[model samples]
Target: QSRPASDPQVVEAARKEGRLIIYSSTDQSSAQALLDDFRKLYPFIQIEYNDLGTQAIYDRFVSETAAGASSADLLWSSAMELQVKLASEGYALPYDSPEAKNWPANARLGNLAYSTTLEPAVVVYNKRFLKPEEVPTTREGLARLLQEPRMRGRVATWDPERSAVGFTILKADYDRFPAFQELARAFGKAQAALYSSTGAAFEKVISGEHYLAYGFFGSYALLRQRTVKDLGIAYLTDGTVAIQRVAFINKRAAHPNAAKLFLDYLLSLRGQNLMAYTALIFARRETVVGEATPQALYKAVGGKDKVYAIPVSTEILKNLDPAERMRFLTFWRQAVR
Candidate 1:
């Protein structure tokens, strides 16, 4: 999530002010835990968090910015590209946190935005509803499932048009396979049900209402599998597609100082450790292990697996032009029908 502030000065003010607001796309419970942990570490700081869907969060930020309201000091979401779009629009207030220096090139937008977590688009299946053989074992394997007679009306996924992560999957597919346009056009015949949000799709998989669903992260999938015997996760053994979660400060924020301090805490090792140990959140890396966290999922699909690289560049989302964007979506809509 992005925050507002005037560099070093705002950072000090936030500490004195004792409170900050975070606009998160993460589930509310997880956000609360993060906030509580932040309070514990910084003792003097109090955080108020608002958990909303990624798309909804973006709409709110845009509307609030337009109305000159400072409802959120920071913006955190799974929709990294969208967040960057905001940054590119001059919404982000630039600051180079000392802790952020350790991150990789792609992880940071130079001084524009910062990476919070690395999210992989995981394949989740209801083990109680389907056998291991029924799960899609590869990228083409997933696409091929649409043709299986039993999969009719049983497959589920979020619509890329609505979900940024879903769009990431498409970008990965298009990058790896030039024929992804045709593949997307063929989705309707797969009898796939498209949801507006991942939570809805996750619930369907966990409740045994659907046998196979795509686009969920390892954190939630593995966490759910603990008590839900029917839930299982495969981190795409054949190909790996990951989404990075990030946060940055808005240039016009009501609590700019608090936003910078919050960003600092998030990049600190403590924040990363808390996320890894939380058991219910997407980790920056897979180095940690616990009751619900499985290392085999990451180990089983490391370098040998194909990479589904989403063609999600700031340029593609920005400079592609309106006609081209609509044209691409039209092709995707026809194919993904």
Candidate 2:
């Protein structure tokens, strides 16, 4: 909850604002559920949720904000480094949300950005194409499968060069996961197809053109398979990196009050519950427990013994440095080829 009651002044202004424009990297279909839920609670505000590419979001928002032209009222993305960088650079407006007081320091970027979702990087596949024996239950299992002749060029993963989250995940894997060498070498042997978007990878998986998508967004896969029956997801029992989505109000929002309300509401228990139950994405709040929170997924898929849940810490920004970024890129290029 944000307060004992909602702030009337913010509510009045937000109600008058009528509409809120959002620039986000989240897919439209999956976010529609949460949009509808938010709308039902506050019918006066309309949503203009623009789902763009991770890089597109950063470039577009930066350019628009710099030009002093109309842009997103709020910026939301799975690109942790980009989002946190924007906040740290004063591109985002500061809002001390009461709802967020309970969140960890890693979950908030000094009141400028709030990290929301907890989606694991999972192996998504076309269930119809992969037989039971073809299914992999762990990272090493996936690596071995990728090296198999039948899986050659039939596998897919995010192109770290283009995908921000993919680059982040891969770096984390190399730093922490013990089986990174094996997996990277396996990727080389299979010549895994790579895409700028995990959604595109999911499309390839859905069509059975690619047998599976390594490091696909958990929420995207979970939401897709709900409507598109052929898809399936596998969490690596050994270890898997998660995507902790973050959002912030734009410094020059067209509807500043409305955007603040949305950001504050999103961090509230009520709004988080909608994210968990309606959207089917992993909710970040401890109070919003159900099928879509981290705990439930951890319990359902063995346990948290190897779940490397990514936090919204400054550590995510390590690769943002030019030197470290190129270092990881060079390493990735060498490994994948």
Best by lDDT: 2
The 10 consecutive residues of candidate 1 with the worst lDDT sum are 285-294
lDDT of 2 at 234: 75
Quality of model 1 by C-alpha lDDT? 0.68
lDDT tens string, model 2, 1-337?
2332357898899998999999988888778877876777778999998989888999998898788889999988988888888888878888888778788887887878888887787888887889645788776888888878988888898788888777777777777786777888788889988888877898888888898888777777777877888787777777767778899998889898888878877788877887788787788886675567878668646787667766676677777889988877787788889
Residue-level lDDT tens digits of model 1 in 1-337: 2232236666568777777778887777555666877676556667778877777888989998898876688888777667878877898888887767667677777787877765567778887777787776665677777677776766677786777656655555555555454445446677678876666887877776677886666666655666777777776766666666778888877677778878877776666666766635655534444422224445656652454433323644642356755766676677656
Highest TM-score against the true fold, candidate: 2
- Model 2 Cα shift for residue 134 (angstroms): 3.6
State how far residue 149 of model 1 sits from its true place (Å). 2.1
TM-score of every model? Answer: 0.86, 0.93
